[PDB]
Amino acid sequence: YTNLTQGAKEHEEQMGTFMGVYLPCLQNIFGVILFLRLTWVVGTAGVLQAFAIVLICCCCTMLTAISMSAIATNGVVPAGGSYFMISRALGPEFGGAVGLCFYLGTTFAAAMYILGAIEIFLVYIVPRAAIFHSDDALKESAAMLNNMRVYGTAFLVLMVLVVFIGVRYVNKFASLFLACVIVSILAIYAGAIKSSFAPPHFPVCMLGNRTLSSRHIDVCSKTKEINNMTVPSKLWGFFCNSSQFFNATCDEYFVHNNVTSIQGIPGLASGIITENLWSNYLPKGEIIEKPSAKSSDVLGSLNHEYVLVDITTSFTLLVGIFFPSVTGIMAGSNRSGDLKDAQKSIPIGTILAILTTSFVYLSNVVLFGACIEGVVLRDKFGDAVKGNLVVGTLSWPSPWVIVIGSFFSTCGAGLQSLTGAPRLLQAIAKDNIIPFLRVFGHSKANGEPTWALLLTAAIAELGILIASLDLVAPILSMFFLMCYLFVNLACALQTLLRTPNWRPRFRYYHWALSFMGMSICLALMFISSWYYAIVAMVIAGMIYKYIEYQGAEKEWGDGIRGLSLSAARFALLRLEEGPPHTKNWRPQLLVLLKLDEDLHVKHPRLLTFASQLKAGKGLTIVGSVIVGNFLENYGEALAAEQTIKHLMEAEKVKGFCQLVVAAKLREGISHLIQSCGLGGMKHNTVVMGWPNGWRQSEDARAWKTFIGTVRVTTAAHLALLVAKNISFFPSNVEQFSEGNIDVWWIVHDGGMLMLLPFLLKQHKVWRKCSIRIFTVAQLEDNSIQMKKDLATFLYHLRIEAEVEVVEMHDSDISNVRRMHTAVKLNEVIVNKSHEAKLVLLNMPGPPRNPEGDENYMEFLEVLTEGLERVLLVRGGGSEVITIYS
Amino acid sequence: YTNLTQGAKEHEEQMGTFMGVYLPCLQNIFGVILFLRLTWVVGTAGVLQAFAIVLICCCCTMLTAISMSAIATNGVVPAGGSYFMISRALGPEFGGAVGLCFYLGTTFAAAMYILGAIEIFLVYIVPRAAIFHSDDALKESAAMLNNMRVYGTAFLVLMVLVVFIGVRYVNKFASLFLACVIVSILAIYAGAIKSSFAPPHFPVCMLGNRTLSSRHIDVCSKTKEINNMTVPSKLWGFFCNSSQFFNATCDEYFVHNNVTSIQGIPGLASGIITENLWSNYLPKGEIIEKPSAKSSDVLGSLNHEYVLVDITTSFTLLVGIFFPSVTGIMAGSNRSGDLKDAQKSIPIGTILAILTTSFVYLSNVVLFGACIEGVVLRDKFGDAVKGNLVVGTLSWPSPWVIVIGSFFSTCGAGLQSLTGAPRLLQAIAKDNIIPFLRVFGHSKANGEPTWALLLTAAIAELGILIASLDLVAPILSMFFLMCYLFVNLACALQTLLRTPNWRPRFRYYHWALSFMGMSICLALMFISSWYYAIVAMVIAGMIYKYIEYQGAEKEWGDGIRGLSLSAARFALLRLEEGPPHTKNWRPQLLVLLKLDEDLHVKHPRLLTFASQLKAGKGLTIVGSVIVGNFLENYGEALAAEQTIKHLMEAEKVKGFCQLVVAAKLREGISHLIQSCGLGGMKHNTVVMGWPNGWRQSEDARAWKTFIGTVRVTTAAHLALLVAKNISFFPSNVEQFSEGNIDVWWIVHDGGMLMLLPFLLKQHKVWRKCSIRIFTVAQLEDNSIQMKKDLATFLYHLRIEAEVEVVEMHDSDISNVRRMHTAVKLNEVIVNKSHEAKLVLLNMPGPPRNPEGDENYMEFLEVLTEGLERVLLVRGGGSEVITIYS
């Protein structure tokens, strides 16, 4: 049946939902707190707050189980247990630091089960085998703690021995460890229902209003008839001198107040639940008393026969003591390779097991408060009911059914933790994620860890030397809550950031359920201590960074450099989806720099102007071509790249250089335009300079390369920016004191001609200029309506530019008519935009047949004649600008 | 002299270190806690713990000043105050959420200064102008708090009026606000030194061991001689009935215990400091008593004439009350545009001002405990010294010097906060980083915020309605500590991550000083409340994300997509430094895929084998060439990219596709080899397939393109991997059950031929194979020594491969001799490495002159004849492999 874990030895190498997931999860959730501490949790805090403590802890594990269901429906559910399932779904660095704190929680749970078994042994079975039976004095805790230290060490030593020499017999005894749990739960239900008509007889002796210990007491009368003569009782001797001394010198409060006997279990049909609703938080050392019991109001001495409060108690202390009961939800995955359909079995079996154990916990809170007297619930170790378990007194056939049933339930839960946690630590020693843990993978002939079992014994001996189960249980509650924190955090983080292999195929999963489970784990950690919560999450964060540094060191070769290569890769893969065209166009530049012979930059002011356009943000790529043969020019291309990078730092350009050696200049330019960047991170716009001296020099190749670049750019659906007289453009230390920036918008590309002066004006050079926008009007439309349609187009974006509509005349808006509509258009622009520091206007497209490339180059010379600084702007076709920054 | 801030109106538009930085910083650090609360902080906690409270708070601001010095030595120190200096050095998202919490700390400081002035008014000047002079009853705090609410509202309303109508007169009164501080400090020093030989006379009336209030008491005798007849005193009437009633019915403790009078200031030359060393933490309501004073031991009633403890006190409550005294260190930067050398003045003036104020605070802790009686220090409001300030009683000329001097010191500090914080909120309304704060930039004719001043009045009225200065002072201590947190955090984070424009030009700056200042700010926040510390750092974190989302929305066009483009840009710029060649070689692939006509992939098993080599990690780029003209083939290149991306997902390749249209196939291949990636994130290795059918088909272009790619690859200093018979390579669902991987290492590229089977073996397909390594031995060396030199070369890296040295014979290690040393070498390989599932061997280089390209292609055909799956490996020249993962 195998409620034990797999771990390694089966990751390198039949069951359904019920016997493969549901019953192994149920066995590991049920345990010692239900039988040894839960009546005391209803005794303190009342029924109403103990119902809230159980409900808060159960909602935390249920949300964590939904995140665990999303992990089991991601990949193919590997055959190694829960550690291999979490590590392959959340990657490394979340497999580690979940596996390490689940390991520490299992190692400290094994100490809590061994201490829980020594308590059922030393109380309730043989209160005679105590080594330190000390003097009858004020130290009743110092001799009890040294009794648990000696017996709990010897119990742990014999239990490491069973894990070593025979673990196959721990496997096949799983069916009777589960049967001891189930018949103990069914005995509590049977004996609570029977108390509606036949309650058991367990009397409690009360002296006035105070609860007396029922040990060392034969009769609760203080009178003690024997045979028609009244010798006073043994209870008389504890509050006076010797038992023949009816004469005098009695204790106060005792001379007053009569001695009565109440029922410890009134049953389900009485109204004792109305007395058990509210809380009884008391400091350590106060007498346990009950309301509706009569008491004078005197003040006597403090006897040794009273039942006192064990420790000081609060709401947050009771949360950390109940919480190890709801853990054990990773048990549904530790038989992963032996399931038929593990993708379907693990969510169904785990979630149903949470609903079963939470019903048993929530219905026991109501049944303890409705059947048991409150002064019996409010003392552990059962001094008021003469040394019985309080939950044992409620069960029908005998209290010995629960005492023997919970002794073997706790002996098997400790044996389960002491095989599981070495098998987990050995599986983290492999995958080589933490290299100094290498020695703890030292498997024997058939799995069987050797040095990992020795380390779990020494850490669990820390939690044996720390005795008192009420102190160990908050320590392992912190480790399990920190384990459930990182699972809930990593599940919601990978679906919000679209981690490449994360796609949970499980309905009723949402990221807001994992975030909600992450918030409850944090709240339960900080109400416990908060300064062990700050330290543990700092230590777990440095473990996250240590595994991430080691993973980057063997993925990229270097640790520190590999952390930037991994961050760049994840961000670039996130962009590879398919809506890349933002409805807010921003120019991402590809700057084309020509090189002359001796390999110097011809026009370095293109880099200055590109730095004023981007202002240190966005993407900028500088592209260049060396004409020649690459097999002979690789050393000349490496030194030419250091020249451009030295020049980019001088002109305050923060970007990338891409240089190529090509046999033709036109071929290397066209390949830079279509292949710069790495997918998503690519250019929007090509920037180049005007070919100055194209007409008068020589052979038609300098100005025909220019037309070929305009054609390649618009075929690629990219934007183009051509700067004319780039040697007259200002440097970075010039700063015009006044001036204009004139935009001549002509029926096309309006969104790009208005964004570009607004972007350029927030640089220091162009800061004090004013934007003027001009349109041309032809007779076959109205001029006034077109103006305020443009004023409203600017006023909602607070660009602050002034608008003029230029009324044109007999004109056209052949070839001699194109050189007549460019002469007329030039004299309108120069009449208004001479002395204007920058002019922006549309450039028209090249002709269809490359026959008219010299008529096109003469068109652009005549149109831009007489202007000092011109930027010709051409849109790519799809540039939607909605928000002007 | 101008101790006021600049803010905006001077960022869009003479002083040295002493008058420009040092004196404005000194004025804003000194204030109300020194004169109104510091004697009570030495009264409680003793001298020794109050010396530690002052030292802890002063070390926090000194480390923050060193981080502030690194900010002032980064850029050019802009002319707008401290907000513009922090925003340009730490970027946005740290300028905001520092400016917002510095704004809230200044707004709540203005309420603390107004409440501090009403206390010096209502006590100590006129205890007659109280509106709610209530009944002489148990409510002495409820009527005092409503007196501060009415006067503090009217004081705030008149003080917003002065900021509005005339602020130039607040500027020019700065020299006399500073003079009131300095002569009050010099009066405390003069009167403490004089008490060594001439102490002042301030008596304290004690009834036994208890401190009596000296108000309403004329004589401290209880006897009251007048003229030879003894009418009992007024002190007799407070502990009895009427003042003529020497008869009977006196109060207990009073009938006993005599009435004595002690000196409130014994002076510096006495030994009163030995009584003031230790702490006096008491709950609210207990009588202030002194040791070494005689008292019977009775138990009387609690009178109204005793001096009681004001509130319950602890160490952490006293840290939050002292801490607003050490703030004000941003004052040294608020005159940034008016300095000659602000880069040198701001570190020198700020750090020296911390040393001056911390000396005054640390030497006042010692002088208060050495000159003042402890029961006078332990009560605020001066009931034991008949209504004087306790620090006023120590000053020489009069107590009225400190009472008037600290009244104007606190009236000017409140006026300074109520002009500074509106000028800060108006400067955050500009830069447009938080768009819903747009209305608070509403400057008047000369700066002068209008709606920002109205918002500072309403938030400071929250801290007036919360009266009791001891409650407001922890609230603004949280905002200033959270301001100093993010400055210390952002300073250490940008120098550890190498933010592009962060280079602090200031010696005695280290990142570990900013991290140390970050740790002290966190500790002082969490010992205060911890649940207002968790909430405030969550709110400040969402403000960081809101500004980062808005900055990415206007830098890239889209908010969510722009966050990945910014993360990729910062990581890629971090790699652009200059040691790119890691001494641990890892293959980063550039996969060359040939396309046939109809634009299908010819050899799709290259993608399968590349996915088995990388196993989902690292960088992989798929490169391809369409032969043709790009102006007609841009639509055929867009559909061919969707075919390859659909195929990459089918073969489990996580990487990038780069496709280019070129006029020649050889030209587009050479440009893909030298220009794929974006700088740092680029390929190490070229992977291509063998040209199957090169001999028998047709014209020599299919196998001459292959030799040209081998030449371009080694000229680029890249590694090469050629796969032969790639159609016989296994798919991703094949998984060999047993087999070998044979490595034939021949005097070259040994580190690459041993890393590649080790990387391939951790994929599921090649998992169950065993690695065999073969070397060849020639006669002119020894064979046994070469074997264990190779065994040791593997055993330290636990590769687990077996080694054989193959003894060769008469051989060579022309052209007919190269085709004879390849026939002999082939028959050794096929004799051992047939039936071997993969063979790896070196390929030799192409010949110098492209004349022997067919002799080279025939050499590689003869050498690899008879083997099913071959990988030919050639190193680039610089591949150092030290750690084998």
Ligand SMILES: *[C@@H]1O[C@H](CO)[C@@H](O[C@@H]2O[C@H](CO)[C@@H](O)[C@H](O)[C@H]2NC(C)=O)[C@H](O)[C@H]1NC(C)=O
């Ligand atoms: C308290 O009362 C008992 C009962 O009378 C006393 O016991 C008697 O003691 C006297 C002398 O000590 C004997 O002569 C009697 O025989 C005793 N009574 C019985 C019934 O045996 C006892 O001594 C008294 N104690 C005190 C301190 O007075």
Ligand SMILES: *[C@@H]1O[C@H](CO)[C@@H](O[C@@H]2O[C@H](CO)[C@@H](O)[C@H](O)[C@H]2NC(C)=O)[C@H](O)[C@H]1NC(C)=O
């Ligand atoms: C319990 O103590 C009370 C007194 O403290 C005893 O009560 C008196 O008993 C008589 C008759 O039994 C009543 O009439 C009185 O009213 C009772 N007194 C009070 C104050 O109620 C009573 O005897 C003691 N109990 C026993 C069993 O003896």
Ligand SMILES: *[C@@H]1O[C@H](CO)[C@@H](O[C@@H]2O[C@H](CO)[C@@H](O)[C@H](O)[C@H]2NC(C)=O)[C@H](O)[C@H]1NC(C)=O
């Ligand atoms: C307490 O003592 C004083 C002093 O003797 C009492 O005052 C006297 O009162 C009587 C009558 O009340 C007068 O005749 C005397 O003349 C008073 N003495 C003086 C000196 O005038 C006072 O009455 C006493 N009080 C009590 C309550 O006894």
Ligand SMILES: *[C@@H]1O[C@H](CO)[C@@H](O[C@@H]2O[C@H](CO)[C@@H](O)[C@H](O)[C@H]2NC(C)=O)[C@H](O)[C@H]1NC(C)=O
């Ligand atoms: C203070 O109270 C004490 C007693 O509580 C008074 O002291 C007695 O005075 C005489 C002489 O003055 C001494 O011999 C005694 O030793 C004192 N008693 C004690 C207990 O010390 C004393 O008179 C009171 N003070 C004044 C000023 O009257």
Ligand SMILES: CCCC[C@]1(C2CCCC2)Cc2cc(OCC(=O)O)c(Cl)c(Cl)c2C1=O
């Ligand atoms: C604030 C982070 C402190 C820890 C640190 C590593 C992480 C493993 C041990 C220390 C330091 C560091 C340096 C980096 O690069 C610095 C450059 O470029 O020189 C990068 Cl990218 C990163 Cl993520 C990191 C880190 O997280």
Ligand SMILES: CCCC[C@]1(C2CCCC2)Cc2cc(OCC(=O)O)c(Cl)c(Cl)c2C1=O
């Ligand atoms: C863990 C909390 C995350 C909050 C979130 C923003 C932040 C303000 C609004 C939500 C969400 C988010 C989504 C991303 O991309 C997701 C894709 O690609 O679909 C990226 Cl890159 C980033 Cl940094 C982020 C964020 O920080």
Ligand SMILES: *[C@@H]1O[C@H](CO)[C@@H](O)[C@H](O)[C@H]1NC(C)=O
């Ligand atoms: C008490 O003792 C016996 C009963 O065991 C009885 O015979 C005897 O008479 C009783 N004593 C008195 C005084 O009634």
Ligand SMILES: *[C@@H]1O[C@H](CO)[C@@H](O)[C@H](O)[C@H]1NC(C)=O
């Ligand atoms: C009980 O009686 C004995 C008789 O010797 C006496 O010494 C003792 O003090 C008594 N007990 C009390 C508490 O007085």
Ligand SMILES: *[C@@H]1O[C@H](CO)[C@@H](O)[C@H](O)[C@H]1NC(C)=O
């Ligand atoms: C007290 O009063 C005067 C002093 O003012 C003095 O003459 C008179 O004698 C004194 N009384 C006694 C009893 O000494």
Ligand SMILES: *[C@@H]1O[C@H](CO)[C@@H](O)[C@H](O)[C@H]1NC(C)=O
């Ligand atoms: C004081 O004397 C008056 C005389 O009438 C008396 O009523 C009052 O109770 C006395 N004071 C005390 C506290 O007894």
Ligand SMILES: [Cl-]
């Ligand atoms: Cl349990």
Ligand SMILES: [Cl-]
């Ligand atoms: Cl668990």
Ligand SMILES: [Cl-]
């Ligand atoms: Cl101060």
Ligand SMILES: [Cl-]
């Ligand atoms: Cl400050």
Ligand SMILES: [K+]
């Ligand atoms: K459990």
Ligand SMILES: [K+]
């Ligand atoms: K201050």
